[PDB]
RNA sequence: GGAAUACUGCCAGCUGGGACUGAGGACUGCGACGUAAGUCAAGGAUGCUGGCAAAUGGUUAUAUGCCGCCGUCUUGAAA
RNA sequence: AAGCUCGUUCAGUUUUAUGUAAGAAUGAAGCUUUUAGUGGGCCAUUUUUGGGC
RNA sequence: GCCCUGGGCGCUCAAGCGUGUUACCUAUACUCUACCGUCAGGGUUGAUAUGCCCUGACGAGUAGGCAGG
């Protein structure tokens, strides 16, 4: 029959059109990121030159990783971790920054480490350990069609779209975070560094808010 | 008896500047001193005595001399020529060359050693 | 390896300013917040850190007899202490003071407060003999009983400690 | 050929705990420190030792052993000669063993235990 | 069997192996002998010559991973090695061609070897280790 | 030449282990002259051969040899981990070993 | 006045050394190369070569490196 | 375990209301009915009791 | 700050003490992969079946309960 070639040609044309759409979207996202970083740097330069202090915006995205085992965990932190999908050790997920969540991290802070990720780390995680949740099953993200089918209605049709939504904390942050399976992370390649892991980071420990150092820690744990 | 003093030339034992020559410009304390070596390219920085070995050579240097003054005094003193004539520098160069010898170069060295040994043995007793 | 940072705050004004020495900006912010409670009554949620910037030595190529005023919380209260240290930079001078305190008084980063650091450009101003001895004219002294790290397990020459 | 490495997982056959010390205790495995799987003690058989489906029951020669005691049983393997090998029961007399071996050779079926009582 | 997607990409030789380079064999009857590289064969072996007239090592196929490279090089442009091929070593006692071809090959290389002083005797001497040797430090 | 050696000599210390647990699947081999892991990096992937003599004449000779390989460095003293298709007997603790120069890359 | 350099972070930059893994089983799927045929590192290893009539390996004894009497009992897991 | 039927309803999870209409965040149901067993003390902790316990 | 009165060998510019900086040792912990099983989802017959399969997760445990040999 003539279907064998006709269907192949039609699907190839549709895939080519979708590829061009994704390419233009990715180019726009990259241009937006570059412009935002350049504008931030220019604003800092202007503040420094004008003899006035800078008013950096609050960190709207944080990442939390489980650092302690299940044993002897008090019930409240254990429930917090369970509701945060931080069940097994060395696992983490992105969470929106709010007082409702900051006060939650305050309780699990002794048993978790968190900070402010970056575009490079988020992209690396999504590309390597990025696993999607479909029909309650764990499906690795390897094709743009897989993500598009589950989040097409939300305007997400590629891995780059998912990364852009996650980093920008856009309107569909809830759905993007839920679709992503909790990240399975190995122990750091270079080790935790400090001789005693179970201590506050600000006093030579590990657990606690470390801001940019979380990006370095994740890459070693990736 | 080698003594630490301003203008004393030293050899760095470990670090990116290991194997290069520097001079003590100003002593900081019992264990740390300030050294420089513009000719060798080592940046002006402080170093501990444990990481540096004092050479027997010495030259006059103004206290707290800057990089330009240190370089000018080093060039004027020509301490580099004295260092090369020292047996220590000769041994260092010999070790470097010997480690850099190729297999064919080593075979030629063995042949020359046998040739020299023949004559040396013939020279004995006589 | 410490680092010098300038941290200011105003509880969202007077713009309280002080110098904080820490290995990273995160520790510097925590130390600034802790010192805020001692200086006055302020909380972290009250405002925000207006600006934090690392301060580099103007010229890390000159030996300076740093005069440092340090207050530490000993096992029986806190006492004001003053010391002079000969070094090339403030970052190294404060680290040396911290190490000396930990070696003797066993005071560490947790219970040490840095008040002021200032250079001394005139002789006879340093009242500490251990620094005063190094302020004389170009001197010379030996390094007896020097040793060498013998990588080889065995030695055949009976090494000597001469320098 | 389709005879990949067959990993036995645990070649050593399990033995009943303390059976060596006491004669009356048989070597047949039976459940009860062993129950607590203490360090340095015999391992307990469990679901971890399950053999792969694609290689279960396969002999090292890569063929299943099928017991045969009549001409019809041997002929039944004519379709499955590629996978099933013949095996003569110990109760078969030598008189029928010759016929069974001849039929197996003529139909290409390998005999796992030839030369029996011959 | 599924259509395995594994193309037979041509072998890539390390930059330390160049025609006319002096090779050292670590395995085989000629282990420790010095040999001269000539041509790379389609079978991923290295065509080498002693030469036979100098150290007795004939033309043989060898594996690169068992050969230590050396900086010493000699001219090998005048030797027509195109005649030799993988089929030249098949067997399915010395063959007559094995002598004449070896002599012809060595005739176009003995002069080059003699051009460099002490190179003939250097090749005639088998390489061997000695007490205190540190191959990792040595450049070979 | 009097010396025909073509392999770097060494010694066998003990298998990879803990305070009370030892895994014979990995053997710690010490190479003479090596001092730091950086130097030992060159010996990675080199075949390790152990030679011992037996009264009985085996199929090929009176000599029996085990064919192993190098895996990775170990410790700060330059020790390198060695793995063999058949683990060496524990009686050879402290015995010498042969480390060949192939496969090579220099 | 000028660069340089330490440090931080990025490279959908390059180039190697070493360790384990070969799991699926005629093509259907997403991609790159190409003007087209076709090729590809693209939903899981292929190509070549050498040694072999005891080959590889199994049970067992003995010696080496490390580890280590039973069921019921009070019930605080216990002697 | 045993029927229904709602796919959503729930939480040892976290702040403003004055304990909540929460179109605040995060994670991801209910009534039944009969059916085996279940009557311990203790390590640390909490409330922080007095003169050893 | 430390001393005096108040695991074995040994260690004394420690191989003792406090602290700072790198590397290394390895749990059944963690990360990648091979296999058994349970649990969950799905393809299946104009015949390919209490079967042939694809995908994911999970694997401690006395009494007790259920299932399969």
What are the defining features of this structure?
part of a larger assembly, 6 chains, A: 222 residues, alpha+beta, two-stranded antiparallel ribbon, C: alpha+beta, Ubiquitin-like (UB roll), 20% helix, RNA-binding
Give the SSE string of chain A: HEHEHEHEEHHHEEH
Order of helices and strands of chain E: EEEHEEHH
Number of structural domains of chain E: 1
Mind telling me the C-alpha Rg of chain A? Answer: 20 Å
> Could you estimate the helical fraction of the residues of chain A in percent?
40-55%
- What summary fits the major beta sheet of chain E? 5 strands, antiparallel
Q: Gap between N and C termini of chain E, in Å?
A: 47 Å
**Strand-residue proportion of chain E:** 5-15%
Main location (chain B): cytoplasm
Family (chain B): Belongs to the eukaryotic ribosomal protein eL14 family.
Pfam family, one (chain B): Ribosomal_L14e
GO molecular function (chain B): RNA binding; structural constituent of ribosome
Strand and helix layout:
This is part of a larger assembly, with chains A (222 residues), B (126 residues), C (163 residues), D (118 residues), E (140 residues) and F (106 residues).
Chain A: H1 3-49, E1 61-66, H2 75-83, E2 91-96, H3 99-108, E3 112-115, H4 119-128, E4 131-134, E5 137-140, H5 144-151, H6 159-168, H7 173-179, E6 183-184, E7 208-209, H8 213-221
Parallel strand pairs in A: 3-7
Antiparallel strand pairs in A: 1-2, 1-3, 2-6, 4-5
Helix pairs in contact in A: 4-6
Chain B: E1 8-12, E2 21-27, E3 32-37, E4 42-48, E5 52-58, H1 67-77, H2 79-85, H3 87-99, H4 103-123
Antiparallel strand pairs in B: 1-2, 1-5, 2-3, 3-4
Chain D: E1 64-68, H1 71-76, E2 84-88, H2 94-107
The structure holds three RNA strands.
InterPro entries (chain D): Ribosomal_eL32, Ribosomal_eL32_CS, Ribosomal_eL32_sf
GO molecular function, one term (chain D): structural constituent of ribosome
Subcellular location (chain D): Cytoplasm
Written overview of the protein:
This is part of a larger assembly, with chains A (222 residues), B (126 residues), C (163 residues), D (118 residues), E (140 residues) and F (106 residues). By secondary structure, chain A is an alpha+beta fold. Helices cover 50% and strands 13% of the residues of chain A. Chain A has one domain. Chain A has helices spanning 3-49, 75-83, 99-108, 119-128, 144-151, 159-168, 173-179, 213-221; strands spanning 61-66, 91-96, 112-115, 131-134, 137-140, 183-184, 208-209. In chain A, a hairpin with a 2-residue loop joins strand 4 and strand 5. The longest helix of chain A has 47 residues, at 3-49. Chain C folds into 2 domains: 1-60, Ubiquitin-like (UB roll), CATH 3.10.20.10; 61-137, Ubiquitin-like (UB roll), CATH 3.10.20. Chain C is built from 3 helices and 6 strands; from the N terminus they run E-E-H-E-E-E-H-E-H. Chain C has helices at 25-39, 90-103, 129-132; strands spanning 3-9, 16-22, 49-54, 64-74, 77-87, 112-118. Chain D has one domain (4-118). Chain D starts with 63 loop residues before the first strand and ends in an 11-residue tail after the last helix. Chain D has a two-stranded parallel sheet. Chain E contains 3 helices and 5 strands. A 5-stranded antiparallel β-sheet of chain E has the order 4-3-2-1-5. In chain E, a hairpin with an 8-residue loop joins strand 1 and strand 2 (34-40). Chains in contact: A-C, B-C, B-E, E-F. Chain B binds chain C through residues 1-6, 26-29, 34, 44, 46, 49, 54, 63-64, 66-67, and chain C through 61-63, 86-88, 92, 134, 138-143, 163. Chain A binds 3 RNA strands through residues 4, 8, 11, 15, 19, 69, 75-85, 88-90, 95-96, 98-107, 118-120, 123, 127, 129, 134-139, 142-146, 174, 177-178, 184-187, 191, 193, 204, 212, 215-216, 221-222.
